[PDB]
């Protein structure tokens, strides 16, 4: 899996290789590579690790499970439209915005954008 990290705080976009499906999440890959996504909780409720994820290989999008905890936090931050909620519930397709501490790496190419601000502006 190839992950491209992008942020205005970063002078250059960073390209990393990651093992898919690890118990350690996207937060693991970011922390091992010095990508400074703000992590401010250990229970997955603060929403400060909000990132925008783009599947660069659109043919290779993997079905996943959006847990009830991540879904509720995305609503509390506001980064979950009603159509994306229905898409996840019916088609098991990931939404545009994810929580990095709760995101499992899949076998594809990803673009991860964050602003350095916690979820909720």
């Amino acid at each position: 899996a190839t992950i491209y990290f992008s942020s205005p705080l970063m002078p250059h976009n960073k390209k990393v290789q990651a093992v898919a499906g690890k118990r350690s999440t996207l937060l693991g890959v970011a922390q091992e590579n010095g990508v400074k996504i703000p992590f401010e909780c250990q229970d997955g409720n603060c929403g400060s690790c909000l990132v925008k994820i783009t599947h660069l290989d659109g043919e290779r999008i993997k079905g996943m499970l959006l847990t009830d905890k991540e879904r509720n936090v995305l609503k509390s931050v506001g980064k979950l439209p009603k159509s994306e909620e229905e898409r996840a519930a019916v088609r098991d397709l990931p939404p545009t915005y994810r929580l990095a501490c709760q995101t499992i790496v899949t076998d594809e190419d990803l673009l991860v954008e964050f602003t350095g601000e916690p979820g909720g502006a």
């Binding site: 705080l9 002078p11 400074k36 703000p38 400060s48 602003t115 350095g116 601000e117 916690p118 502006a121």
Partner: protein
């Protein structure tokens, strides 16, 4: 050689004035100090540069297009022999109000301003709320010693309790500790004792008591610090006294935050709040 410092507190209690005067006092002892304004108001370098207002990082980054092209020399202004920077903030309503702090500290580290050519580095951080940007210096281990300006006001102590909650939250992954508590005179009779008790409840010390002096306004109109305006004044002596005990500070403790009820009972103890009773509720 560098002692990274931050000053927190509620808006409008005198963080900038006390910080600029203490920093100006430090330069008298030959200390090289840098002031980083982490407040969206962006007036924490006014009395050092004698200017209208320092141009913020957000202003030059937008007027030039990005933060990459920003010269360090344009960003860092030297007045009174002490370097000055202002983070600024985004437009009110969009983004995170503390975004300027995140951008400024990141740019300063990349450009080399934070390198150890300075004895002291100070952050004037707004403490009316503890969120991303304003709590970023605590989270990212960028300010080892925190000093809280607090008055004898219910809101001022409430903010002081909130900032101490932020410090303990990150006390196990970094060296951020609570240096002390600065009391600024709100012209309140029991307030000097009130903050002494608050520091004992929090487990920290009252680093000083600053009395409300009208000579500060006479220096403020001049866009100048009190110590240079009137070195022989006693207000400059208190600021000098605060400066020595800041350097001589060694009690960097992890605070013990108190609850809302314990704050209220502490207010009623010193007579600012009256003694409440449960049988006088319906009338």
């Amino acid at each position: 050689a560098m002692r990274q410092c931050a000053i927190y507190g509620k808006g409008g209690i005198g963080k900038s004035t006390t910080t600029q005067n203490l920093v100006a006092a430090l330069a008298e002892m030959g200390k090289k100090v840098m002031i980083v304004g982490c407040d969206p108001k962006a007036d924490s370098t006014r009395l050092i540069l004698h200017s209208k207002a320092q141009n913020t990082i957000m202003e030059m980054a937008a007027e030039a297009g990005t933060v990459e092209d920003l010269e360090l020399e344009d960003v860092l202004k030297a007045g009174y022999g002490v370097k000055c920077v202002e983070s600024g903030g985004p437009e009110p309503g969009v983004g995170c109000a503390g975004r300027g702090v995140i951008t400024a500290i990141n740019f300063l580290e990349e450009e080399g301003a934070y390198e150890d050519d300075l004895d002291f580095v100070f952050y004037d951080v707004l403490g009316d709320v503890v969120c991303g940007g304003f709590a970023m210096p605590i989270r990212e281990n960028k300010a080892q010693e925190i000093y809280i300006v607090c008055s004898g006001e219910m809101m001022a102590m409430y903010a002081a309790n909130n900032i101490s909650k932020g410090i303990v939250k990150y006390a196990n992954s970094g060296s951020v500790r609570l240096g002390g508590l600065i009391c600024n005179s709100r012209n309140t009779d029991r307030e000097d004792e009130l903050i002494i008790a608050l520091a004992n409840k929090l487990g920290t010390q009252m680093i000083h008591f600053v009395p409300r002096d009208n000579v500060v306004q006479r220096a403020e109109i001049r866009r100048m610090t009190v110590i240079e305006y009137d070195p022989k004044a006693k207000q400059a002596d208190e600021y000098r006294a605060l400066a020595r005990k800041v350097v001589d500070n060694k009690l960097l403790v992890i605070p013990n935050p108190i609850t809302m009820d314990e704050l209220e009972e502490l207010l009623m103890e010193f007579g600012i709040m009256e003694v409440e009773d449960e049988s006088i509720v319906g009338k």
